[PDB]
């Protein structure tokens, strides 16, 4: 599921304050940003330019400038006509996936699926009601804009994603070793203890962390969410609730692709 | 209405060692709408000069942000993350955990 997509966030708090954000993402990683002051596509990595030339990037810059300004102004203008209730959010995600092409583009109003772009036309989600159909009628007014959108989704993104992946192959396939430590958690209950194994600093995302007693995996291990840091690395906590007298010989084991078969083993000390 | 309360998770980039510089992260995910006030608190008072990531959203359109600051832990220093949102009657504070 190697997908590249552009996200658009438009927040309309009151009639005076409207904020616009455009960014580009290779899955979980952010690689591009939009600058309204300079109206430029800021590249967050040297390989974020991917495979295209400067002329193609300038053309994309002009297209994005026109599209963003016109879409912001139009959403402002059609707010009462489309029954958009202040305050409201408009969220858009659009891009391509994969080996293969697999394009997509969709828009949500107030956090729920509202409309999407399917072949050369905007189709409303049936559950969104008549407002989505009216929005699609407005969105399908200009055939030229729909043709540009179809070209962007079916041609520009598939050609861009291959070059972006090739130029970022070194960064994407890099291996960063994790580090781990142990700590106490909140008391689960009387006569019971919570043991916490933190793993931080690893890349890529997949990782294996388990509380063990010898070779026996402790199935009471509770693995939390994988959390990011400002660098590219990830963080994760694994907890185990045990009786106060049954905490001896317990340990935490971490397997990551960077460790090259040498699992990190930390041993619990309760003194 | 259809509003999603933020999930707040506090952690450190490295294990806490007194006198050693480290990073404190507050991750605020799965909230809607996006207008939010996330602050990092050192001993109650707000920490100035806090960096945060660009706004984004997950598959289900809920928003997430990462706030982080550089800090040197002390023996008697306590840290927390304080979040305000339309879904919160009072600000929610999640404390850092170090044993």
């Amino acid at each position, epitope marked *: 599921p190697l997908s590249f997509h552009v996200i658009w966030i438009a927040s309309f*708090y009151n*009639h005076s304050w409207k904020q616009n954000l455009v960014s580009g993402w290779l899955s979980d990683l952010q690689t591009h940003t939009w600058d309204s002051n300079s109206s430029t596509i800021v590249f967050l990595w040297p390989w974020s330019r991917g495979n295209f030339s400067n002329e193609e990037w300038k053309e994309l810059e002009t297209l994005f400038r026109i599209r963003t300004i016109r879409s912001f102004e139009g959403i402002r203008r059609y707010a009462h006509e489309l029954q958009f209730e202040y305050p409201f959010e408009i969220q858009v995600t659009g891009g391509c996936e994969l080996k293969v092409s697999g394009s997509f583009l969709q828009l949500a109003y107030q956090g729920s699926d509202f409309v999407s772009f399917q072949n050369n036309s905007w189709l409303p989600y049936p559950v969104a009601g008549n407002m989505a159909k009216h929005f699609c009628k407005v969105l399908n007014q200009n055939q030229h804009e729909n043709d540009i959108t179809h070209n962007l989704l079916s041609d520009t993104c598939p050609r861009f994603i291959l070059g972006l992946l090739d130029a970022g192959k070194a960064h994407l396939q890099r291996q960063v070793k994790p580090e781990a430590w142990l700590s106490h958690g909140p008391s689960p209950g009387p006569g019971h203890l919570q043991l916490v194994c933190h793993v931080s600093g690893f890349y890529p995302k997949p990782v294996w962390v388990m509380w063990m007693r010898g070779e026996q995996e402790q199935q009471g291990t509770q693995r939390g969410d994988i959390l990011p840091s400002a660098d590219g690395t990830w963080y994760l906590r694994a907890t185990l609730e045990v009786a106060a007298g049954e905490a001896a010989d317990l340990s935490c084991r971490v397997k990551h692709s960077s460790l090259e078969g040498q699992d990190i083993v930390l041993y619990w000390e309760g003194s | 209405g259809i509003q999603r309360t933020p999930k707040i998770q506090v952690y450190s980039r490295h294990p806490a060692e007194n006198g050693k510089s480290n990073f404190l992260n507050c991750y605020v995910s799965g909230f809607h709408p996006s207008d939010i006030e996330v602050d990092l608190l050192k001993n109650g008072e707000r920490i100035e000069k806090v960096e945060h990531s660009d706004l984004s959203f997950s598959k289900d359109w809920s928003f997430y942000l990462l706030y982080y600051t550089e800090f040197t832990p002390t023996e008697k220093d306590e840290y927390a993350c304080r979040v305000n949102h339309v879904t*919160l009657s009072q600000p929610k504070i999640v404390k850092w955990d170090r044993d």
Partner: T-cell receptor
Amino acid sequence: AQKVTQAQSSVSMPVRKAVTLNCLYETSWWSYYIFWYKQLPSKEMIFLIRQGSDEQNAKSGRYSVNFKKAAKSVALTISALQLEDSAKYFCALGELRWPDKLIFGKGTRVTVEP
Amino acid sequence: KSVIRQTGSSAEITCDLAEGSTGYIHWYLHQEGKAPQRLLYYDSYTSSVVLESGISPGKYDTYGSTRKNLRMILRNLIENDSGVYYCATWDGDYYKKLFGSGTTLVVTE
């Protein structure tokens, strides 16, 4: 949006005395401003004081405010009642983070007893 | 200061804000016994008038340099349009919202 209500149509108090005008608001903003304004007989609006949700009771000048923040009340007490202070006093609220239009109340006139 | 008009005509008022901030100007309507309310919001940087909820599409318009000579025009005015109109703007600090000179409009059949 939000609601603002001040019920007193008019009040009276002697010179060199004090009086308080009540203002009950109903909002869903966790950060907001409460503004007090005075309307002269010549139809002119004068800024009096601003009140912060995360701020202590503002007591600037001859005016003081009371924050029943749990009860959502911003009361305006005036001091050293003069003749010029006779006007129609209004309370409104606005968004602290995104300043925009003001939700005013019905208003309340004051008549200084001679 | 005072304007008298007849039903079905139009009236152009000007507002006197000392210098404003040459930014975003709100127009407020005040009536006796009622609460003053914002009628429209004018953004000079784009010359875009956004009307309040439930306001007729062409009832009000705004134009002119926002410094001192800022005009708001009401069309197809009815008896309910009588009242005192103000223009207001947030100062640079967004600390207080300065209100300009109000003009009283009287509409008679």
